[PDB]
Design a binder for this molecule. Structure first.
Ligand code: BCL
Ligand code: BCL
Ligand code: BPH
Ligand code: BPH
Ligand code: U10
Ligand code: HEM
Ligand code: SPN
Ligand code: SPN
Ligand code: SPN
Ligand code: SPN
Ligand code: SPN
Ligand code: SPN
Ligand code: FE
Lengths: 273, 255, 325, 76, 44, 102, 51, 51, 51, 44, 51, 44
């Protein structure tokens, strides 16, 4: 079942690898080499998660917990019941995410548009890899990764935050929180402006870009334009992701003491009387 | 505080009420987004047997400016193309299509265009929105490199002509198009290039999407002082189709 | 590589735009005088100003300035009027809420009177700004979506400052006016009432915040991808569908099995953003008044995880072994 | 003339690095020197970009351009 | 004659015959497996 | 029970004094840290020698390790009827400052 | 009962077959896993205990 | 009523069939799971006890 | 049972073959991994214990 | 006649013949492997 | 068995050979690493322990 | 004849011959390696 304007876009070509061996659709979904890899990795990960849940002794969605090994195992492999299943699932998840990104690249190439969406997804993939790969590698044990549980991956966050006394005093955490809040505000304003322009009171004509420009110049004295707002939003989201990754990666391997004490450089400058 | 029954208290009641509201909101949001492209069709152009679990929404009316009438959605597809040069590569559904003639000249694939209205887009005053820079009073270059007078290099290293003018957006003070004057060897007349597909350097302007031989078949504008939505679509998509159809190596797997 | 449309190659400048008008005569209150910034022209528009000066805007500006000056002068007086020490300890000072012993009565100036006065001024200023944003939309003939999305955040603002202290019967439940003090208040509030992770509405607000950030990233990338087909002119695409909307929809349909329209995606964005402060305020309003321990609530409602292993470092290693002796 | 502005910004960055290293030499710490170096970057780079790059190239155009504004003024 | 999929009555009959033929084989294999399992470890 | 918790480790003069007449890390009372303040606003909002680089109350180590004040702040049931005199988040902040010191 | 064949004038067999296959595999996997979460019917642990 | 066949002049049979097919399986699974969460009707534990 | 060949008038082999190829390898890998996570059927630890 | 894929009857019969030929060999190899595994370490 | 050559009338050999090579190399690398991750079959460590 | 790739019957047979020859050579090498590994350090 296609949309009324979809058929002319369903042409062949634009594949990074595979040619016409996997060039077809299954319902709405597009299949390729990376679609096959994604399906394999995702199915294996899900079935392994449910096998671990069965061996744990509970099928409750709130209570399933698959945890990394102990710190004594180091960077080596652990028994599959004592945390090796977590490593296998991590490998599968990394493969699935990379395959998803490359499938998006192939779809972009076929449609003849830009490659901004895979580039944006790469930042989230980078943040996840920093959480599960880079920081445990620098700290020296695979046991520093978070567990795969709906409610058990928040206890890890709490304990990791309280390991430095007051995590709100981390400057990179401040930057990331500010970026998050600014992104949410900008999205709300953009959606509201577009909807108000396209939906006037009953019996009134629709509006245009000039009306929106006037509104925001009357409101706050400046207008960014219909093209600059999208750039601003994309940059804000990417900056939020990048600074979240930086904040998590500087906490363990670079700083060791409490975060409030880091401000002693400001509190003890020679310029003060 | 007390409980109504068992462990049920005010928080649980609020949670369940939010569950119901969220379900209704999801229904409304999904139904609101089905005003274009429905009902679904199969690969032979007929209506499919399956239409999904969400029924079609009700009608809404838009009152357009400048006396252009009204638009009611959902409705019939007025942007539908009539005769497409495409061929099925299979007897069932789910397989690609094969171009019959020249995909860049036939407007199929990444070179496809939509049948928009054959009238220019207007600003608040009722004037055409995009105007050449030689007819806009009080406009001038304030930053960057001026591309006027520079040669244009194609995707294969061929110089086809010089940049002679720019078409600007007066309402938003933004450049939209770059006009090109072709050498007699590479064609005749003038052609437009959208600003998003060019790279201005200090001594040249490069267009990597298409080659030198593809410049004579760019769609031309009917009027020298304005451009319509249909023409912009055909010009802009012709330029996009070259990222795949300008060479055989761009279509085959990269490996 | 191809041009990515992040910075503008060449800028053009023309006569300044003063704005549209109708019979409501918006011109009578607008200022005269505009500027141009070439530094900002690399990303967005270069023209700066003019601005509209009503009565709500002037009232809000004056009253917010009064609140700012009250807080600043109290902080300055708390340090002995020493400018170097005022600069040195700027991030550590605050204007503290009243003491718990005074209930809802008016406290002395030393223990919360200035706090109440400044809070009254801040409330007046915020309400004036909201009225201004409603009035502007009413006079330009537009929808009132901006006012609703502001009211969404004003709801959480009021819950954190006005409604909850009244329900708990004390003015000491408010937030201090300071940089580090307000973060301290956040952490202390989280600790005092169990764990705020196990509050379901905090989880819902986190879900909607994550979804909103994800949705703006996706929408920005999508719009910048199809900008070669005039995809940034969204209103004309809504009124007259072009190839950019079709390609943008087909990308997501082929990616995840369903897509949106050029007008329907903005509805998704509006709701995900608005739903965060609403759920946050609902969750905050229930703390203390109804639930006093959220971990115990989770345990009673059977979604608190259980652990089998032991506690302590001596169950895993030795003190001498840690030091390497 | 964006190249001159970028050159001024690079000069400011280099000056900030040099001042930071000098502050290490004097006896400050890393962050104390870095803060003052960043200050120097922004202030000196902005001043140089506004002043030096504000001298757009002209030999006789500047005089008549200066003289033209001396005629608009005096009658307005 | 109602038809949403475009089939004919005879086509539907011929399809249903083979469908039921397969369903009975699947059920028979499942029944044999259940009998063997019950003989091994009962549940009733 | 404290000094012999894990092994035979005692205390001598060379535990507080380390060659000094004054043992290091001795503390005094500095509770009023600001001016023109009366109650809870007169002890916390300043970075002092007793606060551990935070803005938390510096009244700690005097109400707890010299006087005998309650440290616990939590409620032991999911729903409890709140009464005046119960612990608030300010007591929680003074405990957070004590535990930062710990 | 003799007219149950008219279900294929309403549902397309191509989609029904795929949905039925996915459903059957998921159900079989769920049951085979549920048997392994007990002690009386876990054949791996029973094999371990009988040796 | 003898005239209950007019419900098919108000509703589309395909959507109704899909929704009812989902509903029946969900209800059956919920009922079986509710049975498994008790003590007097858990057949796995009853088999374990009687062995 | 003798008319099972008519499935190829319903499905094109080009999709069915790739679906089956993915499914079989997924099944084999899971089963081998499930075996490797027990104590009685782990053939790597058995060799170490036997030697 | 019902045919969604455009094949004829004889082509479908030939395809089914080859498919069954492959399936039987796969099943025989699996059966031999399972017999060897059961002789090595029984699970019943 | 004697008509297995018809698989090349369904699939393009050019696009199959590359995928087969990638699959084979990845499988070999995975198996070698799995052997390396144990203690009994880690041939890098038996060389050190023997000498 | 049926062909989704464009090859003929003879070409498919010719390709399958060489493909099977390569498969047999690979399998023989793997068998020799496995036998040597089992002799060195026996599993099972
Ligand atoms: C005691 C607790 C500490 C604290 C401890 C921490 C710690 C520790 C962490 C942060 C982190 C963060 N903190 Mg903090 N933080 C605290 C309280 C706060 C407060 C507040 C009080 O208001 C705020 C606003 C924040 C907010 C933040 C963000 C800045 C950041 C979140 C990372 C992120 O979003 O990356 C988003 C990126 C991702 C990981 C997304 C990954 C997505 C992947 C790639 C795709 C998923 C696919 C999926 C499986 C598909 C399946 C679905 C199918 C449909 C089936 N913190 C307190 C003070 N904070 C986190 C951080 O920075 O992480 C880097 C973190 O770990
Ligand atoms: C130790 C810390 C506790 C914690 C304690 C709290 C508390 C306490 C709260 C939050 C709240 C929130 N938490 Mg929490 N939270 C924790 C951990 C986290 C983590 C994490 C670990 O990653 C995340 C992602 C978050 C993030 C969040 C957000 C989901 C939510 C904020 C709502 C909002 O819209 O804020 C955006 C902010 C606003 C909208 C405020 C209102 C703004 C108004 C309109 C301002 C007016 C303008 C002003 C007057 C003028 C200024 C001057 C101008 C320049 C002119 N929390 C931990 C467990 N969290 C809030 C909530 O709702 O929770 C239920 C809240 O109160
Ligand atoms: C995040 C949104 C908040 C906001 C934003 C905001 N306001 C803005 C801007 C922005 C982003 C401008 O760019 C614009 C401005 O001129 O900034 C310098 C402005 C503005 N909003 C103003 C006020 C204002 N906005 C308010 C609201 C808000 N400001 C929002 C809450 C309020 C409140 C809360 O009450 C006030 C009091 C004005 C000061 C100004 C409106 C501009 C105007 O009327 O005239 C400006 C034009 C000129 C006469 C010349 C330009 C001004 C330059 C500072 C001088 C010369 C500089 C040169 C020309 C280039 C500038 C370089 C750039 C780096 C800026
Ligand atoms: C959907 C929820 C999100 C949201 C939405 C939202 N916020 C909004 C709106 C909306 C829809 C507005 O319409 C409104 C607005 O004006 O936006 C531009 C606003 C707004 N949200 C704001 C802040 C804000 N929003 C936040 C968050 C959020 N708001 C959520 C994430 C947060 C936090 C903590 O995350 C903050 C801090 C403001 C920028 C603005 C409200 C403006 C207002 O109320 O002004 C009242 C006036 C005063 C207090 C007077 C101030 C006087 C100053 C001392 C000087 C003048 C101002 C000057 C511009 C600053 C100094 C400039 C220097 C150069 C001197
Ligand atoms: C203006 O512009 C814009 C638009 O436009 C106008 C837009 O719209 C949008 C888009 C925005 C929206 C629609 C708003 C809503 C979006 C959100 C709230 C974001 C959050 C989204 C989600 C939570 C949903 C995402 C769901 C995902 C990722 C899961 C879906 C994926 C699958 C089911 C699998 C993918 C399929 C693959 C890989 C192909 C199958 C693989 C094969 C090998 C095929 C072989 C065959 C088989 C294996 C057997 C058959 C397979 C089947 C049936 C598949 C199903 C299998 C199962 C096991 C179930 C934006 C941003 C925009 O700005
Ligand atoms: C650094 C931050 C710390 C935080 C956030 C913290 C948190 C708390 C809180 C809130 C309580 C009171 C709980 C209640 O109300 O019942 C408490 C008490 C206590 N904590 Fe911690 N703590 C911290 C560090 C430590 C450390 C490192 C020790 C080291 C020995 C410690 C030992 C204790 C003890 C012994 C008590 C009991 C006090 C009493 O009730 O008399 N805490 N802690
Ligand atoms: C114990 O409690 C818990 C919850 C744990 C449970 O476990 C609960 C479990 C349940 C409630 C389970 C319920 C399960 C069901 C209701 C299952 C039902 C299953 C079926 C009805 C399956 C039917 C399968 C039928 C098949 C496979 C038949 C035939 C297939 C074919 C013949 C394929 C070939 C088709 C051809 C050739 C048709 C083409 C013909 C032409 C003429 C073109
Ligand atoms: C104890 O406290 C708590 C809160 C816990 C409670 O439990 C509170 C509970 C309540 C307050 C409960 C309140 C309950 C009600 C108000 C219930 C009301 C119920 C009804 C009004 C039920 C109506 C049912 C009607 C039915 C079943 C109609 C069926 C009709 C048909 C099957 C025919 C369909 C019609 C056709 C086909 C039309 C013919 C078509 C043509 C074209 C002619
Ligand atoms: C992709 O799509 C299509 C349609 C093309 C397909 O589906 C194609 C699929 C393929 C091409 C699949 C190919 C599959 C293979 C090549 C599979 C090969 C499998 C093996 C070689 C398996 C070997 C297994 C050996 C085992 C299990 C040995 C075990 C040994 C022992 C346990 C030792 C103990 C021995 C004892 C006790 C001796 C006693 C033995 C007796 C028999 C009694
Ligand atoms: C125990 O509990 C848990 C959950 C842990 C489990 O392990 C559960 C496990 C299951 C529920 C397992 C279920 C397993 C199945 C249902 C398996 C089914 C397997 C099959 C039906 C396999 C079929 C294989 C068929 C093959 C291999 C056929 C043919 C192969 C060919 C290579 C032939 C290729 C054909 C050609 C070339 C035809 C060309 C002809 C022309 C005319 C062109
Ligand atoms: C233990 O548990 C875990 C999970 C850890 C495992 O390890 C599990 C592992 C598995 C389940 C593994 C499974 C592995 C397989 C199923 C492997 C299968 C491998 C093959 C089928 C390999 C086939 C190789 C075929 C080759 C090499 C054929 C030919 C090669 C050539 C070089 C021939 C070249 C051909 C030419 C030139 C033809 C040209 C002809 C013309 C006419 C032009
Ligand atoms: C003296 O030097 C000069 C002149 C330079 C200055 O003026 C310097 C000034 C400064 C250096 C100022 C610095 C200011 C800050 C650092 C301010 C920080 C402010 C905050 C973090 C404020 C947070 C406010 C509110 C919060 C977090 C939540 C909710 C609040 C409210 C809802 C408030 C509304 C109050 C109400 C409704 C109660 C009113 C009471 C009544 C009885 C009606
Ligand atoms: Fe938009």
């Amino acid at each position: 079942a296609l949309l009324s304007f979809e058929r002319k876009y369903r042409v062949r070509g634009g594949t990074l690898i595979g040619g016409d061996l996997f060039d077809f659709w299954v319902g709405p979904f597009y299949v390729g080499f990376f679609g096959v890899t994604t399906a394999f990795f995702a199915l294996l990960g899900t079935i392994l998660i449910f096998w671990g849940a069965s061996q744990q002794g509970t099928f409750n969605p709130w209570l399933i917990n698959i945890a990394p090994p102990d710190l004594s195992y180091g960077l080596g492999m652990a028994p599959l019941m004592e945390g090796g299943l977590w490593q296998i699932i991590t490998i599968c998840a990394i493969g699935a995410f990379v395959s998803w990104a490359l499938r998006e690249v192939e779809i972009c190439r076929k449609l003849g548009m830009g490659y901004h969406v895979p580039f944006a997804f790469s930042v989230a993939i980078f943040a996840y890899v920093t959480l599960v790969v880079f920081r445990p590698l620098l700290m020296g044990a695979w046991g520093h990764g978070f567990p795969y549980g709906i409610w058990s991956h928040l206890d890890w966050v709490s304990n990791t935050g309280y390991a430095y006394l007051h995590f709100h005093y981390n400057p990179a955490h401040m930057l990331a929180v500010t970026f998050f809040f600014t992104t949410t505000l900008a999205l709300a304003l953009h959606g509201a402006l577009v909807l108000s322009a396209a939906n006037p009171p009953k019996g009134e004509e629709v509006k245009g870009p000039d009306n929106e420009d006037t509104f925001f110049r009357d409101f706050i004295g400046y207008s960014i334009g219909t093209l600059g707002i999208h750039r601003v939003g994309l940059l804000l989201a990417l900056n939020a992701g990048f600074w979240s990754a930086v904040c998590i990666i500087i906490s363990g391997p670079v700083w060791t003491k409490g975060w409030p004490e880091w401000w002693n450089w400001w509190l003890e400058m020679p310029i003060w009387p | 505080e007390e409980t109504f029954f068992g462990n049920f208290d005010l928080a649980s009641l609020s949670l369940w009420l939010f569950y119901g509201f969220f379900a209704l909101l999801i229904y409304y949001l999904q139904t609101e987004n089905m005003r274009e492209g429905y009902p679904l069709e199969d690969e032979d152009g007929n209506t499919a047997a399956n239409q999904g679990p969400f029924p079609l929404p009700k009608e809404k009316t838009f009152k357009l400016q400048h006396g252009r009438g009204e638009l009611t959605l959902p409705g019939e597809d007025v942007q539908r193309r009539d005769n497409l040069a495409l061929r099925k590569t299979a007897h069932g559904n789910g397989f690609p299509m094969e171009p019959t003639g020249d995909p860049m000249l036939d407007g199929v694939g990444p070179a496809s265009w939509s049948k928009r209205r054959d009238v220019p887009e207007l600003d608040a005053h009722g004037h055409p929105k995009i105007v050449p820079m030689s007819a806009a009073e009080g406009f001038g270059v304030s930053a960057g490199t001026d591309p006027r007078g520079l040669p244009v290099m194609a995707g294969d290293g061929e110089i086809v002509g010089l940049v002679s003018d720019m078409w600007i957006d007066e309402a938003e003070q933004l450049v939209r198009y770059l006009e090109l004057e072709l050498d007699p060897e590479w064609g005749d007349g003038k052609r437009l290039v959208q600003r998003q597909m060019v790279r201005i350097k200090s001594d040249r302007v490069k267009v990597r999407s298409i080659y030198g031989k593809h410049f004579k078949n760019v769609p031309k504008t009917k009027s020298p002082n304005q451009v319509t939505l249909l023409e912009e679509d055909k010009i802009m998509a012709y330029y996009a189709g070259g990222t795949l159809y300008a060479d055989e190596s761009r279509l085959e797997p990269q490996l | 590589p191809e041009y990515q449309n992040i910075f503008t190659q060449v800028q053009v400048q023309g006569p300044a735009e003063l704005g549209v008008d109708n019979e409501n005569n918006l011109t009578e209150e607008r200022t005269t005088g505009t500027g141009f910034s070439q530094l900002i022209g690399w990303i967005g528009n270069a023209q700066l100003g003019p601005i509209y000066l009503g009565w709500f805007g002037i009232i809000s500006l004056v009253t917010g300035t009064l609140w700012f000056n009250i807080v600043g002068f109290n902080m300055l007086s708390q340090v002995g009027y020493s400018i170097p020490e005022f600069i040195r300890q700027l991030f550590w000072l605050a204007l503290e809420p009243p003491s718990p012993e005074y209930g809802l009565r008016m406290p002395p100036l030393d223990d919360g009177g200035w706090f109440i006065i400044a809070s009254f001024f801040l409330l007046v200023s915020v309400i004036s700004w909201w009225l201004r944003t409603y009035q502007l939309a009413e006079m330009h003939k537009m929808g009132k979506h901006v006012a609703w999305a502001f009211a969404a955040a004003i709801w959480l603002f009021l819950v954190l400052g006005l409604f909850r202290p009244i329900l708990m019967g004390s003015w000491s439940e408010a937030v201090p006016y300071g940089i580090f003090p307000h973060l301290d208040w956040t952490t202390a509030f989280s600790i005092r009432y169990g764990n705020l992770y196990y509050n379901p509405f905090h989880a819902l607000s986190i879900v909607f915040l994550y979804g909103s950030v994800l949705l703006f990233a996706m929408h920005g990338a999508t719009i910048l991808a199809v900008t070669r087909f005039g995809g940034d002119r969204e209103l004309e695409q809504i009124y007259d569908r072009g190839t950019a909307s079709e390609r943008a929809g087909l990308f997501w349909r082929w990616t995840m099995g369903f897509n949106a329209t050029m007008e329907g995606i903005h509805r998704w964005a509006w709701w995900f953003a608005v739903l965060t402060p609403i759920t946050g305020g609902i969750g905050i309003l229930l703390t203390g008044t109804v639930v006093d321990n959220w971990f115990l609530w989770a345990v009673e409602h059977n979604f608190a995880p259980d652990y089998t292993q032991d506690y302590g470092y001596e169950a895993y290693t030795t003190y001498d072994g840690f030091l390497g002796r | 003339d964006m190249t001159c502005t970028i050159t001024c910004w690079g000069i400011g960055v280099l000056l900030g690095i040099m001042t930071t290293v000098g502050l290490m030499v004097v006896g400050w710490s890393f962050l104390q020197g870095a803060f003052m170096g960043v200050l120097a970057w922004l202030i000196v780079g902005g001043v140089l970009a506004v002043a030096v790059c504000g001298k757009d190239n002209a030999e006789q155009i500047r005089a008549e351009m200066a003289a033209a504004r001396e005629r608009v003024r005096g009658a307005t | 004659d109602l038809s949403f999929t475009g089939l004919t009555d005879e086509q539907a009959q011929e399809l249903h015959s083979v469908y039921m033929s397969g369903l009975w084989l699947f059920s028979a294999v499942a029944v044999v497996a259940h009998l063997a399992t019950f003989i091994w470890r009962p549940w009733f | 029970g404290h000094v012999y918790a894990n092994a035979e480790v005692g205390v001598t003069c060379f535990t507080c004094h380390r060659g000094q007449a004054v043992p290091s890390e001795v503390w005094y009372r500095i509770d009023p840290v600001t001016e023109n303040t009366s109650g809870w606003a007169s002890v916390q909002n300043r970075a002092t020698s007793l606060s551990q680089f935070t803005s938390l109350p510096s009244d700690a180590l005097y109400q707890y390790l010299l006087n005998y004040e309650q440290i616990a702040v939590h409620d032991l049931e999911s729903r409890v009827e709140t009464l005046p005199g119960d612990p608030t988040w300010q007591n929680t902040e003074r405990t957070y400052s004590l535990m930062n010191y710990f | 009962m003799s007219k149950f064949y008219k279900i294929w004038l309403i549902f397309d067999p191509r989609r029904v077959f795929v949905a039925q296959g996915v459903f059957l595999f998921l159900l079989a996997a769920m049951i085979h896993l549920v048997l392994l979460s007990t002690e009386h019917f876990n054949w791996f642990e029973l094999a371990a205990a009988n040796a």
